[PDB]
């Protein structure tokens, strides 16, 4: 990450969003599986979107 | 009636199957010949 | 490069209609394109209106070689040649028959 986006909108939600990080994805995964209104673009919202920040934040090593 | 073979699946894996051949010089040489012939099966033990 | 695109008129130089013109309605892969109204052929199948359609079935124009379309000249009623690049303007189609180039 270049300094214009480096550690913005990411470290300040690293622990405080953790109680909704998997629940909000699960909520949408359960809904994107139903076929409601034939919406298939939801599979590009519950995936290809929600790992994109935290996996660029990875630099601590170990646990 | 019958003709010299068992349904025994253990005897079909224990001595000519992958781990049993992979434990032997000449068996590891068969794994190479199956790759040289280009078969989709490395072992027919199953 | 792409010589034809969606906006210029094509003469269709094949022995398919031997007159009629159109434009590209969709651009495809592997050297093919679709041209508006050129091949609206009926298919020998039932329309199944189900009292849910008024109704009928509808023709859709089918893929042809991009090498068969050719641009229309609109000056003598013949085909034209495109060409590429100029000393001014980015990635421009040259139009080998016009003294003006963008």
């Amino acid at each position: 990450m270049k300094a214009k986006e480096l550690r913005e909108k990411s470290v300040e939600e690293l622990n405080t969003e953790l109680l909704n990080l998997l629940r909000e994805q699960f909520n949408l995964r359960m809904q994107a599986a139903s076929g409601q209104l034939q919406q298939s673009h939801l599979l590009k919202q519950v995936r290809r979107d929600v790992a994109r920040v935290k996996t660029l934040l990875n630099e601590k090593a170990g646990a | 009636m019958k003709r010299t073979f068992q349904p025994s699946v253990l005897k079909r894996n224990r001595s000519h199957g992958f781990r049993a051949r992979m434990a032997t010089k000449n068996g590891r040489q068969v794994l190479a010949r199956r790759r040289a012939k280009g078969r989709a099966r490395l072992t027919v033990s199953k | 490069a792409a010589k034809i695109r969606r906006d210029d008129e094509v003469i269709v130089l094949t022995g398919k209609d031997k007159g009629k013109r159109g434009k590209v309605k969709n651009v495809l892969s592997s050297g093919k394109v679709i041209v508006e109204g050129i091949n609206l052929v009926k298919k020998h199948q039932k329309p199944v209106p189900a009292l849910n359609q008024p109704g009928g079935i509808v023709e859709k124009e089918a893929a042809i070689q991009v090498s068969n379309v050719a641009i229309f000249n609109a000056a003598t009623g013949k085909a034209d040649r495109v060409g590429f690049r100029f000393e001014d303007g980015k990635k421009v189609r040259f139009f080998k028959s016009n003294s003006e180039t963008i």
Binding site: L18, L19, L21, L22, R23, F26, R29, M30, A33, S34 | - | -
Partner: protein
């Protein structure tokens, strides 16, 4: 720590079939998909605080075989794990 919030990696999808639409109609029971480890050590302590409902009991079975699709070569269905979850009201000791 004891239990992390990383452990909320449970559940895959809903499922829809007449067995549930008939033989689970007079119970508050639901059908779900789970992945290979079936989360058997953490699912009960997780799903009670993940889906707005309280859980009574959890089970999971494996849907196996059906290797046939075409008259030439093989097209495998491959194994998948199907969960049956019942939601709670009151107590029963």
């Amino acid at each position: 720590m004891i239990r992390e919030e990383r452990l909320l990696k449970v559940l895959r999808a809903p499922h829809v079939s007449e067995k549930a639409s008939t033989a689970m109609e007079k119970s508050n029971t639901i059908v779900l998909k789970v992945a290979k480890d079936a989360t058997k050590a953490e699912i009960k302590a997780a799903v009670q605080k993940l889906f707005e409902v309280e859980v009574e009991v959890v089970n999971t079975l494996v849907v196996k075989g059906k290797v046939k699709r075409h008259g030439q070569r093989i097209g495998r269905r491959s194994d998948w794990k199907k969960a049956y979850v019942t939601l709670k009201e009151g107590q029963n000791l």
